[PDB]
Scaffold this active site. Structure first.
Site, PDB file in Angstrom:
ATOM      1  N   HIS A   1       0.805  -1.213   0.000  1.00 17.09           N
ATOM      2  CA  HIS A   1       0.000   0.000   0.000  1.00 17.09           C
ATOM      3  C   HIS A   1       0.848   1.278   0.000  1.00 17.09           C
ATOM      4  CE1 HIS A   1      -3.933  -2.011   0.769  1.00 17.09           C
ATOM      5  NE2 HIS A   1      -3.152  -2.909   1.348  1.00 17.09           N
TER       6      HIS A   1
ATOM      7  N   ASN B   1     -10.377  -2.657   3.197  1.00 18.71           N
ATOM      8  CA  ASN B   1     -10.082  -2.720   1.783  1.00 18.71           C
ATOM      9  C   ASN B   1     -11.379  -2.442   1.010  1.00 18.71           C
ATOM     10  OD1 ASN B   1      -7.323  -3.174   1.538  1.00 18.71           O
ATOM     11  ND2 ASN B   1      -7.533  -5.417   1.602  1.00 18.71           N
TER      12      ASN B   1
HETATM   13  C1  HEM Z   1      -2.002 -11.104   7.582  1.00 20.82           C
HETATM   14  C2  HEM Z   1      -2.274 -10.255   6.628  1.00 20.82           C
HETATM   15  C3  HEM Z   1      -1.718  -8.911   6.532  1.00 20.82           C
HETATM   16  C4  HEM Z   1      -0.544  -8.376   6.999  1.00 20.82           C
HETATM   17  C5  HEM Z   1       0.560  -9.118   7.672  1.00 20.82           C
HETATM   18  C6  HEM Z   1      -0.576  -6.981   6.689  1.00 20.82           C
HETATM   19  C7  HEM Z   1       0.502  -6.110   6.939  1.00 20.82           C
HETATM   20  C8  HEM Z   1       0.512  -4.813   6.512  1.00 20.82           C
HETATM   21  C9  HEM Z   1       1.599  -3.887   6.749  1.00 20.82           C
HETATM   22  C10 HEM Z   1       2.860  -4.270   7.451  1.00 20.82           C
HETATM   23  C11 HEM Z   1       1.250  -2.689   6.215  1.00 20.82           C
HETATM   24  C12 HEM Z   1       2.073  -1.403   6.221  1.00 20.82           C
HETATM   25  C13 HEM Z   1       1.869  -0.655   7.497  1.00 20.82           C
HETATM   26  C14 HEM Z   1       2.715   0.634   7.605  1.00 20.82           C
HETATM   27  O1  HEM Z   1       3.886   0.681   7.141  1.00 20.82           O
HETATM   28  O2  HEM Z   1       2.142   1.613   8.106  1.00 20.82           O
HETATM   29  C15 HEM Z   1      -0.088  -2.846   5.678  1.00 20.82           C
HETATM   30  C16 HEM Z   1      -0.812  -1.794   5.157  1.00 20.82           C
HETATM   31  C17 HEM Z   1      -2.191  -1.909   4.837  1.00 20.82           C
HETATM   32  N1  HEM Z   1      -2.957  -3.034   4.929  1.00 20.82           N
HETATM   33 FE1  HEM Z   1      -2.411  -4.769   5.607  1.00 20.82          FE
HETATM   34  N2  HEM Z   1      -1.740  -6.676   6.089  1.00 20.82           N
HETATM   35  C18 HEM Z   1      -2.488  -7.811   5.983  1.00 20.82           C
HETATM   36  C19 HEM Z   1      -3.807  -7.958   5.466  1.00 20.82           C
HETATM   37  C20 HEM Z   1      -4.613  -6.903   5.132  1.00 20.82           C
HETATM   38  C21 HEM Z   1      -6.034  -6.956   4.986  1.00 20.82           C
HETATM   39  C22 HEM Z   1      -6.808  -8.256   5.105  1.00 20.82           C
HETATM   40  C23 HEM Z   1      -6.482  -5.693   4.761  1.00 20.82           C
HETATM   41  C24 HEM Z   1      -7.839  -5.136   4.635  1.00 20.82           C
HETATM   42  C25 HEM Z   1      -8.912  -5.705   5.263  1.00 20.82           C
HETATM   43  C26 HEM Z   1      -5.279  -4.820   4.764  1.00 20.82           C
HETATM   44  C27 HEM Z   1      -5.337  -3.484   4.512  1.00 20.82           C
HETATM   45  C28 HEM Z   1      -4.204  -2.647   4.537  1.00 20.82           C
HETATM   46  C29 HEM Z   1      -4.276  -1.244   4.229  1.00 20.82           C
HETATM   47  C30 HEM Z   1      -5.481  -0.479   3.785  1.00 20.82           C
HETATM   48  C31 HEM Z   1      -2.992  -0.760   4.389  1.00 20.82           C
HETATM   49  C32 HEM Z   1      -2.556   0.646   4.200  1.00 20.82           C
HETATM   50  C33 HEM Z   1      -2.837   1.419   5.491  1.00 20.82           C
HETATM   51  C34 HEM Z   1      -2.456   2.844   5.251  1.00 20.82           C
HETATM   52  O3  HEM Z   1      -3.073   3.523   4.408  1.00 20.82           O
HETATM   53  O4  HEM Z   1      -1.472   3.320   5.838  1.00 20.82           O
HETATM   54  N3  HEM Z   1      -4.227  -5.626   4.991  1.00 20.82           N
HETATM   55  N4  HEM Z   1      -0.483  -4.133   5.892  1.00 20.82           N
END
Ligand code: HEM
Ligand code: HEM
Lengths: 480, 480, 480, 480
Positions: free
Chosen positions: B52, B124
């Protein structure tokens, strides 16, 4: 709430028990509070300063009591000006846990929060230093730290460097004298050491030296007493300062300058820009400027003292640097270290912020707390944000002419490595100080200095003073 | 002053010319202003998010318009509560310079600044996801990024992962449908995707799903239009949102939940905690909660959007996590990434701060802007600083029983990999959407997917739907 | 073993399922493998370069085919010398995900692994640049990036900077011409841009310019084609190079220099050290040196290309810098950026290591992979480790004389901002190129440039060439 | 060459003089060598460990001399197995410059480079610890460090924590006894402290405790002697170990285990997993395993000792963790700290590498020295790179059942805070040790402990032993 929070302000629930599957069960990964607390704990420590890791400090005021406007237009040094300040005192070589009462140079670092920006005067408790070119400084500092295999400090390595760099003799004599062991920071003097430039309103330039004389008087430990204190209270100096201020015994210093007109810099018989040389008080008498008082302890040692960033490059109008090559090297080194030790945006931390408005073209970077909103991001913009564009000679510059070289300074008629420490030993020291010098130096040389360095050390001390040198050699031979 | 300053508030002198020995001469090391400006420039860039990286956002409000106090005591969801919020929208796989209009999942990440702490709902534009265990997530994300030798994205690798992980079929069908290319962020829905827990004042627990329905209506690009826009305006979505808000066209969403009593979680015929499964609307109808409106653009994109830190672990009283293993893995991962991407003290940055008092046992660390003064540094202190010590079962927990295993979820009677996407393709999609699906998938498979992955892909799509699968295989064979 | 390991070489057990309390249970904190894998995933991304984030490269050889020993003693440029090399090509302004086929300067950065150390020649696909003093470079680059509020690139800001800095006209004309859109990196030229110094065995000095002429021929995209490709394949240039080398179509360039004796530098009627000026081929003809061929793709893009560190300060005996103030600023900036982007010890990474022995006084630091064992840690040691101590004038230096100033270069008789681009537009461009120029520039100016910048832009282009300028103004008025 | 190089292998020219405009002139910015040397010097220091900053170590071997294959299949503990190892010894609270001979727990951390991966046994010189839940560990450690305002260590704060956490009484009694001041590391024992799991080839599980008995005999300093040594030689322990090994006096320990069958863990009358409890030798006698010998000093202290990364999570087949909540918290904390203290890729540094092949799905990150070339980047690939996929119960797991709680352990019939230290004081200590205990504790309490903590401390010691407690209270009242 439950009595405390997470970093998001939600209830912590517990600061004493982790989240588990039953009271005897394993810890769950989604104990967010545990993770946050432990991960932050794991990052509490930061790189210490190199050098001057071990130190403490206090806030205070500077009051200019005399008129020096003939020599400088700097706002903090106009008669009647009062300025808030921060001081940090330190040793040089030991790490952040090391005893305060080791023999060493002490730092005397000042930050003045002036009406024309923060001015840093990063001094020492000595008017001179060990080397003349900044390329040698990392080598010198490493010789004062630990051996690469064993991790032990080593007299052999220290004397190896000093005897191969006889420019060091002036400072080594000062350090091995009684001033190497100040009893407290309140009972030591401070100096700028380098020549700096002062510039008056008409644009006339002066070479200056800063001197800070303690109002509490000079006091020392002997070798034996300092050693005992290192075992009894490794934080003796830090405790002494904090406790003095807490009971209202506010330490003070008088600041005075030596002042040399620009043109005399060219002709003086001692190199005025050689950091191993003092200016004789008969030729350049002290002119009183003002009073430094420390009257407020930090509320948070880490946030206010550990994260304080000083740099000799932080000059203000009316003050400049000088042809001392060591000073010019320092102008680069401090901010470079701080970007690593503290962070890209160290200048935004409260203790480092000025008391005046900032309009600087720095943007973004990790941990950007402050920003300029939608303001233009470049100079020569049509968007209403001002920039600077002064052209031609700067008010606090000098001149140069030559080929690009890597060379020692040109020797003037009065310049050499051993005359000024000779005078210190023969004329300034009394008999008691000469006795302590011989006992200090012979002690250091008996602490593991080997041939051929040991014999070079005898010659070095005989170059400083034939008698004292012979006495040191005798004390070492006796001790062997 | 000269029109701008250094970081110390001293005059900059020039933002256009460096300090040199004469107008045609070399630059001097002690040009402090040059060094400071250039060194800060050299540190303007920070690690982007993984995943993202490419995204933008806006501030707004959330207003709870209906009564859901039967299900949650959370302060922001009590009827009449208004809360300030931040939203960030993003793609998943592309880096920070990548076109907005690539086919991808879109993030829908919300931070609510509530009266009981910051609550993050990191959703999401899809109700499901590709995998069921967080151990697979790094593998999935790497398959969506670049090949290790060439640095190119690769359809072969993407389909290799998906066909070896058929749990992916539901989300891959949703992604390859029309919703893979939202026309703007204002014209897409948001979902929590996971089951979360709601807890009411009596301590009764509910499993919930969050749904955010756009008031602007759903709109899409075709493959051709999205490709053209990627070339014409790589920042089309960012520009669209910023421009809409700037002209007062404030986008809104209605939030509604599906609500399942705790006990029904045990017996429902579909695994309620499987992130690859939706809950049929007939079994669990949407219950309206409130209105999300975005009405304020950032003043500083870097400081407010780039440095925003969201975490699903940031729950508030009345809300908890669930037995979805993916959610539990996320509870760890986000803060861990943020400590590296932003810094140890990211929680202190303005955008990340709560609107309520914080009393948390975190101290020091790099770039500590805020501190607790002389307050006690440990819980169970006699110094007047409170701590938390609730014992026993937590209000937002559940229970577990078993051996320590590494295993897939137990299959319930209604659980499999292909029934829900089958229904999407056969019953929800119309004929036009089925046509676009076949053209999308065959296009992807013609973009370099090789045997034996290509044949596994034919079988995967035939498992989703025999007809559509045969049409995809025909389109690929035709295109070869 | 189980098929894979942890970082300690112990069996991983699973890369697909986390450790839980029963198959449907929560994840346990002590799933070390999960933590290690996820934490490393969270740290895979690093800061991109600023500028030149988006790029790729290949390894190859350089063969010196002609005798230039009259001008340089540099080992890699002696006749018959073959040297392994690395090249990285890049755009300037876009981030790491940005399309390859945007209009921009392209980097042409070379590292030669010579027998006397690594020599970096960090060039561009243009012989000139936009500004003459490095203090302006951060301002220029920020004007080419994103607005601080919206995060959008902005033509208005770009033209605001360029029209306020008319020294930019030469490069802006080159950039807005056909060379702003190379079809591939294999079909573009490279240049050193700056004047460098060559020094022969006798110590005689020459000012040189480097030119790299493609053996594949110059090829371009039109605006329309480049835009379409940005949508169809954001990695078109990276793919083109990797695929060419993989099928054995090894691209080559001929390197040739212009050579000016030291003394002619003082009297030439164009400032030879002004980065906005080319040297007329009639006055200084190209002298052929050798052949650059790229013949090996990276095995690991991240480790070998992303972590490659180039610096113009990395000269070798026989080569020096010059009085170009921009070059002197670059000598500082690159290593400073690399310490942040890569790490303190970036020089130890395989791609950055030389092929010759290193005996350098650098110690410790984070992630120290190599060390000097028990060897002495300081120069002037008695422990058997050599150091350097050459005194006096350096072989690759010049001279300076003056007051310390912040000033533009002294104008020579042939120096101005608009004559060289005038010649490019009137004499070098043909009618087809003039037509494309007018369509390019008017397009840029119609993309949101506002008064008063828009009118300043008309005047700028009329200063370059009255006719073409009037045609641009007409095309803009027509398009409005 | 000139005697030394830059980091690129080019001649350094000088390690003693900077590049200036004439011998008395200013330093030039493009002195690349100066910049590189000084910038690296500025980054030599790294964050120290928290806790256990001050330490040293040596390499050696472990030889398994007895047959324990009935209890573990771990390769290093099969009879006849020899394994290379690294040991690091340390204090807990002091910083990296702090005296070795302060009263403190000593770390006894071992890394075994086994044929099935690196196994770390991160022990202490005590069999117990101060607290039972890892949530309390940051609080405990901060109470042992410095006050937030003054930066001084404080007895008041230490006793405030201990008296509010009476679980601490066992370890505090051990620490305040003679073992709080080991004379050298060679003259102290080591323990695992926690219960660990051993698993044999049949999959049968045992709870074990590790014990390391010095072959040199136990030796101590008195309070007075340790204090004197802190002043005379702050590095006494480091010097002692290095000098012993250098003269061939290789220290050794015998490792023996206590072994409890899995099922007895459920019923034993003392909680076997409570870190504040020892297992009575009568119930569980020591079973000899093998011999640890240290026989090689580091060649580079920084690279091999300072950058060594140990973690209790680094188990090998045949060894597991246990229901001790403290151990489970440690499984997370160490690697998390190391990613910050050392770097993302700390596992790649030579001292941290295993002696067996690594196939782990970790990629990229800052300072990536090693890479997997073009190998697949995801598990379940069709590209020939293996992965792990064991399903079901893990060999080194146990089981859990319950609600999610934050709670103390269930007390067993023999469990309380004061019985085990009572036995230490009454039955194990002799009269001389009881005398030293009273003098140690009263000394600590006279060092600034205030009401109401001071009275709570009297009660704490009376709870340990009524007599000794009364003697401590009398000594304090006398000293007041
Ligand atoms: C086990 C599964 C997942 C892991 C390990 C994971 C891990 C991560 C990590 C490490 C980031 C970056 C955070 C940062 O640097 O601030 C991220 C961002 C994000 N993830 Fe996940 N994620 C997972 C599943 C999902 C799911 C299922 C969704 C939605 C329901 C999601 C939505 C997002 C969104 C929207 C961002 C961006 C947040 C922002 O705008 O700063 N992710 N994810
Ligand atoms: C070329 C010679 C020198 C170099 C390169 C140099 C460099 C440094 C550096 C890099 C630091 C740490 C800065 C930080 O992390 O915040 C430091 C600290 C310090 N230096 Fe220097 N130094 C030099 C000579 C001197 C001299 C001659 C003096 C006194 C006149 C001095 C006084 C100090 C003091 C007092 C500190 C501690 C400042 C504080 O309390 O934070 N140094 N030096």
């Amino acid at each position: 709430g439950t009595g405390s929070t997470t970093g998001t302000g939600a209830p912590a629930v517990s600061d004493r028990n982790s989240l588990t599957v039953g009271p005897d069960g394993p810890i769950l990964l989604h104990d967010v509070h545990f993770l946050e607390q432990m991960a932050h704990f794991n990052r509490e420590k930061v790189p210490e300063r190199q050098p001057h890791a071990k130190g403490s400090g206090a806030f205070g005021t500077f009051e200019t009591t005399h008129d020096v406007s003939a020599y400088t237009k700097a706002a903090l040094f106009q008669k009647g000006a009062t300025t808030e300040m921060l001081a940090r005192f330190s040793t040089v070589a030991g790490e952040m846990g090391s005893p305060d009462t080791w023999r060493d140079v002490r730092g005397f670092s000042l930050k003045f929060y002036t009406d024309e920006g923060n001015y840093d005067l990063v001094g020492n408790n000595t008017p001179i230093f060990f080397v003349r070119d900044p390329m040698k400084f990392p080598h010198f500092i490493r010789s004062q730290k630990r051996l690469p295999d064993s991790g032990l400090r080593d007299n052999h390595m220290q004397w190896d460097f000093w005897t191969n760099n006889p420019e060091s003799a002036h400072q080594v004599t000062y350090l091995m004298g009684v001033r190497g062991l100040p009893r407290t920071w309140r009972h030591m003097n401070g100096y700028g050491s380098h020549t700096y430039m002062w510039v008056n309103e008409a644009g006339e330039r002066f070479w200056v030296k800063y001197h800070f004389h303690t109002h509490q008087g000079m006091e020392f430990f002997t070798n034996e007493e300092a050693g005992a204190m290192a075992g009894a209270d490794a934080d003796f100096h830090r405790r002494d300062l904090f406790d003095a201020i807490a009971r209202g015994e506010h330490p003070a210093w008088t600041m005075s300058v030596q002042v040399m007109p620009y043109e005399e810099g060219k002709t003086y018989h001692i190199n005025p820009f050689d950091l191993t040389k003092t200016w004789p008080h008969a030729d350049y008498p002290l002119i009183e400027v003002g009073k430094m008082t420390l009257n407020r302890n930090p509320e948070n040692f880490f946030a206010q003292i550990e994260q304080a960033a000083f740099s000799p490059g932080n000059t203000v109008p009316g003050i400049g640097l000088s042809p001392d090559k060591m000073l010019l090297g320092r102008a680069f080194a401090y901010n470079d270290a701080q970007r690593n030790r503290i962070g890209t945006n160290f200048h935004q931390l409260p203790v480092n912020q000025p008391k005046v408005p900032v309009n600087t073209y720095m943007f973004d970077g990790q941990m950007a707390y402050h920003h300029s909103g939608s303001a233009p991001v470049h100079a020569t913009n049509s968007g209403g944000r001002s920039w600077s564009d002064e052209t031609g000679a700067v008010h606090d510059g000098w001149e140069a002419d030559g080929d690009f070289v890597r060379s020692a300074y040109t020797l003037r008629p009065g310049d050499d490595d051993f005359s000024q420490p000779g005078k210190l030993v023969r004329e300034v020291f009394n008999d008691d100080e000469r006795r302590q010098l011989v006992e200090t130096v012979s002690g250091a040389l008996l602490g593991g200095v080997r041939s051929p360095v040991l014999e070079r050390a005898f010659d070095y001390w005989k170059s400083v003073d034939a008698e004292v040198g012979q006495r040191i050699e005798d004390a070492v031979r006796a001790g062997q």
